[PDB]
Ligand binder design. Structure first.
Ligand SMILES: [Zn+2]
Ligand SMILES: [Zn+2]
Length: 37
């Protein structure tokens, strides 16, 4: 995946707080109604 903040590839929920899908909470579908509305 790609970082929420570094803008780098090679990223995951353990490389940073979240991938670009989120920033912290990173649940499987929450972003479309909270973090990406
Ligand atoms: Zn990062
Ligand atoms: Zn979130």
């Amino acid at each position: 995946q790609t970082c929420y903040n570094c803008g780098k590839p090679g990223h995951l929920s353990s490389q940073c707080r979240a991938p670009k899908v989120c920033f912290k909470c990173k649940q499987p579908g929450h972003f479309s109604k909270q973090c990406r509305s």
